[PDB]
Design a protein around this nucleic acid. Structure first.
Ligand SMILES: [Zn+2]
Lengths: 316, 119, 51
RNA sequence: GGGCCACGGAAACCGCGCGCGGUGAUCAAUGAGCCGCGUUCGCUCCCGUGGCCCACAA
RNA sequence: GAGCGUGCGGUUU
């Protein structure tokens, strides 16, 4: 369990608001070219390359020009590397803060009883400090122990170094320790699921689409950028507000249809249409209870606009 | 697994390990997936042998389709551990290709007969 | 060394899921080259498994 | 004047590592050691250049 | 320019 896993109440502000089907393009309605411009790949990085090379490759193979990955994985490490294509690139800034999960293989340098190990690992749940900063360990689970090998799952605040963590466990046990194997299993909303795709599948799916004429598997290779923001608090806006916020208009109360409860001032919120398209990313200027009771005022400072300006009419 | 484009009799697999066993200290074989593949590409491979427990599949799975393009006989064997040991090395081999046959020149001619039957 | 039950999704060093009993597989994706020398042939094998 | 979007706030060479081609090994053939060629993304705030808007959602 | 994200570390203009 990480913080993003909290269930959110949805408060309804305008019960009567519906959406016009002829404006915008809900994710599963985007022509495949357009599906890529706003696409996010949930990539399973291989052992060997740096996160940056992997991203250069993808850019070369799929003939893109923009693409940035989320939290950097080290060369030796594998697993969940979210990769944001083209106009979806910036959504990554919303992944960078969210929590991570790893499965790690710690190898001890001395002999320690299984009970000491586990008992001691589970001291580290809580706060930790690594060289000079203070990160968080959400949970530690010891899967299995073969003599000096300890396989365990760990859940952390972003920016936490597992290598370093393992070292501190080595020291707490006294005999010392080192990381012999690391795999990231979750980064924010990206988990190991049917969307998690290898480079071989991805480039193959690409060629089935480009050279065979079958766009199907490649479409499954790419997720809508809305995905990258699933773990964020949301406020859904009426069509009449959508072109205005895509123009840098900040979102006032009267544009709200529906929001998540629990939003606090300063929080980072996704701004969605009722078709569940991601319009913009922004920062609350009101809590959730304020946005609801109120009827006029700025509810969200719009800071990053993803939705193109021509998808919805300028209803002002 | 999925790269295994056909079944193989028990006695037939043991046959394959016999040839490579022979064609090494006698003939000229090339062990290791990377060498075996270069061999097929160059078309000097007489018979390619493929282990069945190769994980991940992407390591050897390019071979059966490659042999087709090169019309070169290829057979499967149960174990990458025994296929390795049967090639003058104490490690494991996912893939062997006898470049040049030894005492097992007949035993080799016999196998292309039984693979062609299994397709 | 790190393995995974293809059914339970459990992580393990063993070859038998100690959760479900299925055979486990290596957690890591295959190594990839930006040159992909045998892409031509993998794809052939792959298209057959799919149609 | 304010917001949003776009572009601009260097360049090169070496090293580890990694990857390809060659060779192919005294528990790394799922590739040692050696030789050669290659090889690294974006984001955030701030400041210039330009574009679109100024929209409390009717 | 200050930074971040684990991925980079050295010569110079
Ligand atoms: Zn499983």
């Amino acid at each position: 369990i990480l913080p993003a896993d909290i269930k959110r109440e949805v408060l309804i502000k305008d019960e009567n608001a519906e959406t016009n089907p002829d404006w915008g393009f809900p994710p599963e309605k985007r022509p495949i070219e357009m599906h890529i411009q706003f696409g996010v790949i949930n990539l399973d990085k291989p052992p060997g390359p740096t996160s940056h090379e992997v991203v250069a490759w993808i850019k070369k193979i799929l003939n893109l020009e923009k693409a940035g990955h989320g939290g950097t994985l080290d060369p030796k490490v594998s697993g969940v590397l979210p990769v944001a294509l083209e106009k979806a690139t910036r959504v990554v800034q919303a992944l960078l803060p969210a929590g991570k999960e790893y499965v790690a293989l710690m190898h001890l340098h001395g002999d320690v009883p299984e009970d000491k190990i586990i008992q001691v690992m589970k001291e580290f749940e809580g706060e930790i400090i690594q060289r000079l900063r203070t990160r968080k360990v959400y949970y530690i689970e010891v899967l299995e122990i073969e003599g000096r090998d300890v396989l365990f799952r760990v859940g952390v605040e972003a920016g936490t170094y597992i290598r370093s963590l393992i070292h501190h466990i080595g020291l707490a046990l006294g005999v010392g320790a080192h990381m012999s194997e690391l795999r990231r299993t979750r980064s924010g909303p990206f988990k190991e699921d049917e969307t998690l795709i290898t480079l071989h599948d991805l480039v193959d799916y690409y060629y089935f689409w480009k050279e065979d004429g079958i766009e199907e598997y490649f479409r499954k290779a790419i997720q809508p950028m809305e995905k990258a923001v699933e773990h964020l608090p949301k406020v859904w806006i009426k069509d009449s507000a959508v072109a205005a916020v895509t123009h840098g208009a900040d979102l006032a109360v009267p544009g709200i249809a529906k929001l998540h409860a629990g939003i606090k001032r300063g929080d980072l919120v996704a701004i969605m249409t009722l078709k569940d398209e991601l319009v913009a990313l922004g920062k609350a200027m009101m809590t959730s209870q304020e946005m609801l009771e109120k009827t006029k005022g700025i509810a969200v400072d719009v800071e990053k606009v993803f939705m193109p300006r021509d998808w919805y009419p300028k209803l002002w | 697994p999925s790269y295994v484009k056909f079944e193989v009799p028990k006695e037939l697999a043991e046959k394959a390990l016999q040839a490579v066993e022979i064609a090494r200290d006698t003939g000229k074989i090339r062990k290791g997936t990377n060498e075996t593949t270069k061999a097929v590409e160059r078309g000097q491979a007489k018979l390619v042998i493929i282990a069945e427990d190769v994980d991940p599949e992407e390591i050897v799975a390019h071979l059966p389709p490659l042999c087709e393009e090169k019309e070169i006989p290829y057979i499967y064997v149960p174990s990458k551990k025994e296929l390795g040991a049967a090639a003058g090395i104490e490690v494991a081999a996912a893939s062997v290709a006898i470049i040049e046959p030894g005492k097992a020149r007949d035993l080799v001619e016999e196998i292309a007969m039984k693979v062609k039957e299994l397709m | 060394r790190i393995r995974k039950c293809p059914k339970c999704g459990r992580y393990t060093l063993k070859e038998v899921c100690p959760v479900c009993g299925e055979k486990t597989k290596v957690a890591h994706p295959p190594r990839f080259s930006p040159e992909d020398p045998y892409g031509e042939y993998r794809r052939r094998w792959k298209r057959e498994v799919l149609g």
